[PDB]
């Protein structure tokens, strides 16, 4: 029924339908292999959870990923294709394998490429749709970035994971956030495509913070009040940072067509707002005239998704196929 392949120092015991495994990842989550699906006849991604339950900490994350991956369903989000265990019983239950869609690359390089407004605004359109579905499911990523967004040669895009320089101020700082926390990231990723390099490069969360302020300008006093005592002192001790105009930050020397270059800037001007309360929302971003051209209600507004005890919960989740 199953078979075993040795990849690195771990043993991948998976369904015989999957072959040509090759490790393409290895983080906290676990090990990810690229593999050929002989039944669907397509390339998939097999993820073997690392220590599913070797501590109440891991189990909840494992239970977290499984449940979400199940209900969550959109084209602009990594699609689940299978979840299986090589173990015959709950007693022996030890490994969790999640098969998902396999994409061609993330936006780490395509961002430093040359995209026309079509490809530019389209990829972004698709980000907004996936992020919105995530949101309409109570999931607020908070950690979107180039290596987080995956794409295909046919110009389609998807969000890789449900998350938790591209972080929003609310996040860099110990502040509370809302759903538009992810618009900042979109604002960052969009801007980096036009620039060609990371918008706000910070050697550390403090420097990072300085780059942004110096660039966009210091926020209004109403925001400063909403700041922790210690950090508020820090900002009030620096020179007056007025930021620059988006025409200076984003000069026409980067855009190809008079209307579209201005629109992309106007949009950037509403996503890169320090004060989260004056920052554009996804719905508004999807309606913006630079993004709205690809708008489709079926995409942009698709209906929402939905101890030793953790071993059973997970197992039960996995056994529901």
């Amino acid at each position: 029924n199953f078979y075993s392949v040795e990849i690195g120092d771990s043993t991948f015991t998976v369904l015989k339908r999957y072959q040509n495994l090759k490790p393409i990842g290895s983080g906290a989550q676990g090990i990810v292999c690229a593999a050929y699906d002989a039944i669907l006849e397509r390339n998939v991604a097999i993820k073997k959870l690392s220590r599913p339950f070797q501590n109440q900490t891991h189990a909840k994350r494992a239970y977290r990923e499984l449940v979400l991956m199940k209900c969550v369903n959109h084209k602009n989000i990594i699609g689940l294709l299978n979840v299986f265990t090589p173990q015959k019983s709950l007693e022996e239950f030890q490994d969790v394998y999640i098969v998902m869609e396999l994409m061609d690359a993330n936006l780490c390089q395509v961002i430093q490429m040359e995209l026309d407004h079509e490809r530019m605004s389209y990829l972004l359109y698709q980000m907004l749709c996936g992020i919105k579905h995530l949101h309409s499911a109570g999931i607020i990523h908070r950690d979107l970035k180039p290596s987080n967004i995956v794409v295909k040669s046919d110009c389609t895009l998807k969000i890789l994971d449900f998350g938790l320089y591209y972080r929003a101020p609310e996040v860099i700082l110990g502040m509370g956030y809302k759903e538009n926390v992810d618009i900042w990231s979109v604002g960052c990723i969009m801007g980096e495509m036009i620039k060609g390099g990371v918008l706000f490069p910070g050697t550390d969360h403090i420097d990072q913070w300085n780059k942004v302020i110096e660039q966009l300008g210091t926020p209004c006093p109403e925001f400063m009040k909403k700041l922790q005592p210690t950090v508020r002192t820090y900002v009030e001790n620096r020179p007056k940072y007025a930021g620059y105009s988006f025409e200076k930050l984003f000069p026409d020397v980067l855009f190809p067509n008079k209307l579209k270059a201005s629109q992309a800037r106007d949009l950037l001007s509403k996503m890169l707002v320090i004060d989260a309360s004056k920052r554009i929302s996804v719905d508004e971003a999807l309606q913006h005239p630079y993004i709205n051209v690809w708008y489709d209600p079926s995409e942009a507004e698709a209906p929402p998704p939905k101890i030793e005890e953790w071993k059973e919960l997970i197992y039960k989740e996995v056994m529901d196929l």
Binding site: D104, A105, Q109, V110, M113, L115, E118, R119, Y122, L123, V151, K152, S153, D154, C155, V293, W294
Partner: peptide
């Protein structure tokens, strides 16, 4: 407006 059918990853 037709949607891009390709993106050059290379």
């Amino acid at each position: 407006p037709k949607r891009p059918t390709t993106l050059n990853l290379f």
